[PDB]
Amino acid sequence: DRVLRGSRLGAVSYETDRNHDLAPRQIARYRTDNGEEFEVPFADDAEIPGTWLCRNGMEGTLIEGDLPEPKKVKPPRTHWDMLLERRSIEELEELLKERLELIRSRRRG
């Protein structure tokens, strides 16, 4: 009545699992913020980046102090800055001093 066909997106090879003449491997070590080593077996002919994602949840950096670069991180959209893009310093400071005078006359009496 209803017989179909189908396959998952992937092909299957047929090799032999030899365990001696493998590719030469360098073992690299990374580290997260919370002291979590994650041993990464690379190739021996392989560039080692300073940072690498781990199962710990974050991009764990290298265990070396060779590449400590923290530079390119900033919040591009702060409410203060997008306030500054539409409101001027004297207008904002006038509003601030008016509300300060109001709360001085309210709390003081």
Partner: protein, 1270 residues
């Protein structure tokens, strides 16, 4: 060590998850709700199909495509992120979700009883408000700082209330001054004062509401101070505005939170030991509802106490992710994509979690944040068990989404739906035909099936003969079916046993192994004897063939399940390879004797000799091949190669007649000599007429005294001679061979006058309708039996129909009575009789109305047969699930207890009439003690098998009561010892030390369903057996006695009321509501007034519940009742089950003992425990002082007893798989893998039969005297 998964298991232990264990399992953190790309059809990054987490999608293929070689292995690629390995790791690589805020489980909250609520002592509905964010709950509150701030802030509170009262009296004075102004500005004008009193009343009402609102806020001040003085942990605070009041005034000196993290804080600051000691003190000292509640909590409290496991498992911080191969993202040819519905739930949880993380880094009001937390918690609950609380999440077509738990729950989970059965390879099936030239161990096989079956074997062989140099050439040669494959196929197929099976497979003989042999044709030939065991007709029934592969499996199918080694049914020990209908007719015609036949011996002398004698059966055969002799005359042969019967041989040779040699005379027929040569050489001469009972006795005695191969060759020669004389016998059915009785009209007129008189008397109104129908029923039953008597009188003996009936081939006499005579009475759709009735026979042909009446009963029988089939299958399932653990373990239990056996009770005149129930009660059971006749010597010692000669010796010695050793009294731990169970009837010798007697017992009990007719308001059929093993209170509750002595038979109005005179001097036993739907008990005659009763004599006539008879006569006489009660039902249909098969079931019912005194031993009253644990309970804790533990015997039904098992993996297969797991998870209940149900699931060897360690570590080596010959 469940990492590399070695093939050596000892225990399977289920525990409880932790966040650390989950993040240790996981291979990453999924954080995007993306599965595939819409165009390139490749998996995404950090999604549900993230290759970096769940491995690659092709074999040693990294994602960019650089490393594609097997020389690379286990090497992570910095460009694409993945590690090079096989694509099989997508089956078992785990991921986890990271959660921003904690969320609790759904199993530990919603499944009643709420385990978290029992642990923390809250109401479950009042815990729902905490975990679904609708009520505030205080975590902890200080006491010393609160203690000094009691005084200081009560001074502050009084000062604030004083300022509040100053405001109140100022407002009251201002409103009173306005009221006096209203007085002055109304009184100054002289007018109608009614409107002038209205402003005064308005001012008074304004003063009233001012002071009332002031009193209300004063009450608010009193309430916040009172609740601050009442500040304790585990306090619900509704009205979060009032909670905000508590925050702004008395927000210090306490800590509160709200939700799953509040529950987490609560459990973290919760030491269980103090509450454990408090609950211990409460249950030791107090009593009542509070003690019952403390016990019900103390179960899980003491479980956490004995556990090293944390109680932190209810909350959760990291949901694990199932690997993507179990939730396949398949696509079809044609761009259609299919998922398995968990991806939607996972995507939903991912969306909610990401949105909450975005809101919590943004900074948002608590309404938004807590609404997001609530929908996240609901999403997690919908993932774990969709449909428990609230409403199930559905999708397209509104079907609810199948959650994780519905892959285990119900009949579509991985506990039933893949554990009923699975389809196999190397199989096949076809229709079956009769193969009456085959030997017993052979079976046919069509070549177009066997070529497909044995395809790899024939590929190997015809490569080894170089007909095809490579495997692909061999495959194409087999597909094109070149003629060399048959000559290869015979050599590859010889001595290679295959299996056969016919669905449905009722009992153990349903699967038998046969040596194949090639048959040109298309249908499986079959030996005609084994159709009795397979229950196979030839109306088109289909059998299925399997094929064993390994050397072990071929050894099992050659030695165990071979068809020639299964002759005796294990249920009763009667043979099942006995010749059936056709050959039985043949042997009956062969061995009957006819007086007056041709060439008979007569001693007529004085003129000529006898002319009947013959020198040898060879001469007799020559004469019968001429025209002179018939087969069934009476002659006097001189046999030489047949051993004479015991009396004649004792007369002539005394004892030394070695019948190979000598010669003797015998006045038999020819046919009995010809049949008697088929039997073996040592067997004594028979000289009877071979009715079917006689053939059963012969084959039973033969199988007792001789090996199975001799029995097999004997029964095959019996089949051959039976068919050859069946076709000579001239059994035909013709309408001249169906004679009507010549007295039927006279009989029917004589009964018709009585029927007409009864109808006339109802016509005059002399009686009622049911009396009319009852009288007519009795008249026509008498008429039917009269015409049956007349028919049997009229029919001659040599008629074909009465020959077929009388031989025991098939049928009974009632079918001949309907075929000629009268049909009798036909029932109704409800089941009552029709008082018409039928007065015609099928030879004379019915008429239209009678055929219409007959149709009711025909259709009713047709439907109810299938109904009874389904119910018998259900009963077999329950019995198998109860007794699937009783297997033979030791060889000698070494006890002295045992049951007794009635065994041919003494006559009042004084003689040993043999009791009719011996083969099902006394045969094949070892003797517990010896038997000694009249204090003389012993006759049969302990340990004898108790067969027929021992039975005859005990009967001749004149004894009745022996004390057999049996199961029920077996003293081993688990399973029974071999020497108790007695002779296994399938072998005829003692059982081995691995036999699965429980499954043999269950199949032998449940197989003779579909032949249990009930009757024509007390159950008497198959459901009577069903309520017996369930042990429920029966409908026809006839009570039993409680003390002996005389009794007061006594009846009131329309229902009886009988009291019992006690002889113990106690209170007089009174039975009250004896309804008139029953009759009085008949014993020894009717129950008399003043008659002497026993302590357990049944009062009324009917059935007694076994719980009552357990309470009175104790644990022994229940089994003696329960065996005899069930066995009576099978005797009503002429079906024999040996009582040791029922003895295993009744042993399993009485395993448990209830608890009434927990005392000082650890227990709960009203709970059930095993006796063997309870034995060691009061052998360990009673050392250094005995401790109170009172136990009573309880009898439980089979469904109740199977459910209270111990191996949790087996217990999950029945019902409440969510519930069965979720409490074994708390107790850390490690399984043992000792039954037979669990080892099937996890695919290891079963621990019964060839699975035990006695029979699996056998070392095989040549002997050294034959080593040197090599």
């Amino acid at each position: 060590g469940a990492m590399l998964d070695v093939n050596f298991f000892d225990e399977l232990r289920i525990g409880l998850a932790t966040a650390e264990d989950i993040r240790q399992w996981s291979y990453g953190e999924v954080k995007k709700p993306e599965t595939i790309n819409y165009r390139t059809l490749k998996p995404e990054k950090d999604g549900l199909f993230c290759e970096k987490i769940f491995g690659p999608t092709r074999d040693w293929e990294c994602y960019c495509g650089k490393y594609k070689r097997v020389r690379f292995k286990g090497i992570i690629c910095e460009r694409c992120g993945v590690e090079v390995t096989r694509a099989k790791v997508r089956r078992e690589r785990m991921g986890h979700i990271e959660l921003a805020a904690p969320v609790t489980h759904i199993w530990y909250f919603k499944g009643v009883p709420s385990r978290l609520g029992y642990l923390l002592d809250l109401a479950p509905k009042d815990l729902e408000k905490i975990i679904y964010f609708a009520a505030y709950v205080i975590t902890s509150v200080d006491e010393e700082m609160r203690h000094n701030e009691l005084s200081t802030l009560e001074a502050e509170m009084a000062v604030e209330r004083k300022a509040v009262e100053d405001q109140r009296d100022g407002e009251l004075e201002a409103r009173a001054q306005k009221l006096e102004a209203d007085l002055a500005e109304l009184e100054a004008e002289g007018a109608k004062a009614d409107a002038r009193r209205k402003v005064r009343d308005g001012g008074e009402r304004e003063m009233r509401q001012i002071r009332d609102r002031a009193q209300r806020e004063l009450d608010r001040l009193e309430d916040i101070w009172s609740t601050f003085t009442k500040l304790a942990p585990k306090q619900l605070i509704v009205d979060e505005n009032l909670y905000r009041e508590l925050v702004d005034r008395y927000g210090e000196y306490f800590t509160g939170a709200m939700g799953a993290e509040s529950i987490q804080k609560l459990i973290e600051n919760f030491d269980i030991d103090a509450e454990a000691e408090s609950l211990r003190d409460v249950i030791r000292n107090g009593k009542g509802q509070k003690k019952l509640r403390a016990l019900k909590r103390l179960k899980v409290v003491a479980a956490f106490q004995q556990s090293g496991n944390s109680p932190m498992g209810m909350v959760l911080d990291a949901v694990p992710v199932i690997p993507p191969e179990l939730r396949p993202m398949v696509q079809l040819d044609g761009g259609r994509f299919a998922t398995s519905d968990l991806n939607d739930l996972y995507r939903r949880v991912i969306n909610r979690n990401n949105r909450l993380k975005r809101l919590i880094d943004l900074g948002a009001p608590e309404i938004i944040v807590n609404n997001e937390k609530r929908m996240l918690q609901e999403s997690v609950d919908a993932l774990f068990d969709n449909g428990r609380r609230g409403r199930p999440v559905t999708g397209p077509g509104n079907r609810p989404l199948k959650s994780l738990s519905d892959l285990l729950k119900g009949k579509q989970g991985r506990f039933r739906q893949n554990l009923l059965g699975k389809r196999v390879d190397y199989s096949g099936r076809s229709v079956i035909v009769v193969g009456p030239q085959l030997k017993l161990h052979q079976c046919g096989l069509p070549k177009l099936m066997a070529l497909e079956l044995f395809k790899p074997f024939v590929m190997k062989r015809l490569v080894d003969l170089n007909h095809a140099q490579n495997i692909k050439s061999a495959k194409r040669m087999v597909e094109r079916q070149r003629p060399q494959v048959w000559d290869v196929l015979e050599e590859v197929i010889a001595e290679h046993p295959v299996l056969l099976n016919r669905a449905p497979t009722l009992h153990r003989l349903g699967i038998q192994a046969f040596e194949p042999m090639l048959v040109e044709g298309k249908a499986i030939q079959l030996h005609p004897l084994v159709c009795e065991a397979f229950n196979a007709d030839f109306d088109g029934d289909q059998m299925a063939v399997h094929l064993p592969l390994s050397a072990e499996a071929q050894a099992e199918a050659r030695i165990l399940m071979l068809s020639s080694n299964n002759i005796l049914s294990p249920a009763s020990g009667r043979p099942l390879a006995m010749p059936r209908l056709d050959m039985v007719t043949g042997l009956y015609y062969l061995t009957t004797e006819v007086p007056g036949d041709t060439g008979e011996y007569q001693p007529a002398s004085g003129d000529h000799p006898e002319t009947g004698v013959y020198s040898s059966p060879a001469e007799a055969i020559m004469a019968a091949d001429r025209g002179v002799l018939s087969v069934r005359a009476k002659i006097k042969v001189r046999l030489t190669q047949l051993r004479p019967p015991v009396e004649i041989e004792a007369e002539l040779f005394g004892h030394s007649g070695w019948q190979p040699g000598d010669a003797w005379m015998a006045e038999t027929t020819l046919g009995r000599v010809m049949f008697n040569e088929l039997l073996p050489l040592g067997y004594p001469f028979v000289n009877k007429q071979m009715h079917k009972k006689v053939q059963a006795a012969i084959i039973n005695d033969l199988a007792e005294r001789y090996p199975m191969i001799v029995v097999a060759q004997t029964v095959d020669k019996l089949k051959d001679a039976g068919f050859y004389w069946a076709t000579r016998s001239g059994v035909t059915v013709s309408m001249a061979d169906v004679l009507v009785p010549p007295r039927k009209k006279e009989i029917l007129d004589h009964y018709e006058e009585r029927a007409d008189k009864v109808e006339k008397q109802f016509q005059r109104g002399a009686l009622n309708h049911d009396e009319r129908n009852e009288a007519l029923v009795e008249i026509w039953k008498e008429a039917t039996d009269e015409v049956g008597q007349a028919l049997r009188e009229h029919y001659p003996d040599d008629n074909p129909i009465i020959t077929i009936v009388d031989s025991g081939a098939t049928g009974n006499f009632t079918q001949t009575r309907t075929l000629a005579g009268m049909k009798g009475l036909v029932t109704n759709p409800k089941g009552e009789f029709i008082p018409r009735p039928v007065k015609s026979s099928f030879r004379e042909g019915l008429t239209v109305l009678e055929y219409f009446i007959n149709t009711h009963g025909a259709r009713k029988g047709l439907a109810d047969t299938a109904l009874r089939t389904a119910d018998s299958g259900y009963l077999t399932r329950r019995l198998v699930d109860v007794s699937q653990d009783v297997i033979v373990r030791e060889h000698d239990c070494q006890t002295e207890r045992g049951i007794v056996v009635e065994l041919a009770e003494r006559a009042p005149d004084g003689t040993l009439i043999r009791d009719p129930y011996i083969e099902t009660s006394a045969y094949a059971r070892t003797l517990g003690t010896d038997a000694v006749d009249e204090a003389g010597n012993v006759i049969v010692e302990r340990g004898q098998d108790l067969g027929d000669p021992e039975i005859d010796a005990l009967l001749a010695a004149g004894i009745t009561q022996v004390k057999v050793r049996s199961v029920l009294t077996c003293a081993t731990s688990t399973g029974v010892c071999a020497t108790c169970y007695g002779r296994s009837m399938a072998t005829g010798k003692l059982v081995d030390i691995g036999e699965a007697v429980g499954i043999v017992a269950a199949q032998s009990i449940g197989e003779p369903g579909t032949q249990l007719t009930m009757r024509t308001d007390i159950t008497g059929g198959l459901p009577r057996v069903q309520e017996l093993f369930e042990a429920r209170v029966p409908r026809g509750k006839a009570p039993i006695a409680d003390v002996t002595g005389r009794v007061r038979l006594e009846d009131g109005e329309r229902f009886y009321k009988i009291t019992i005179v006690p002889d113990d001097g106690g209170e007089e036993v009174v039975y009250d509501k004896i309804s008139k739907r029953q009759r009085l008990r008949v014993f020894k005659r009717v129950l008399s007034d003043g008659d002497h009763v026993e302590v357990g004599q049944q009062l009324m006539e009917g059935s007694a519940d076994p719980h009552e008879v357990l309470r009175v006569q104790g644990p022994r006489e229940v089994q003696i009742h329960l065996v005899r009660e069930v066995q009576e039902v099978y005797r009503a249909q002429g079906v024999s089950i040996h009582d040791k098969h029922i003895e295993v079931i009744v042993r399993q019912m009485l395993r448990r003992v209830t608890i009434i005194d927990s005392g000082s031993t650890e227990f709960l009253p009203g709970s059930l425990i095993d006796r063997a644990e309870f034995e060691a309970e009061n052998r360990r804790v009673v050392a250094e002082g005995g401790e109170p533990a009172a136990g009573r015997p309880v009898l439980m039904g089979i469904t109740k007893a199977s459910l209270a098992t111990d191996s949790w993996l087996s217990a999950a297969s029945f019902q409440e798989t969510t519930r069965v797991l979720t409490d074994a998870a708390i107790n850390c209940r490690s399984d043992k893998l000792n039954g037979l149900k669990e080892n099937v699931i996890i695919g290891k060897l079963i621990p019964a039969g060839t699975g035990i360690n006695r029979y699996r570590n056998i070392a095989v080596q040549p002997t050294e005297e034959a080593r040197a010959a090599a």
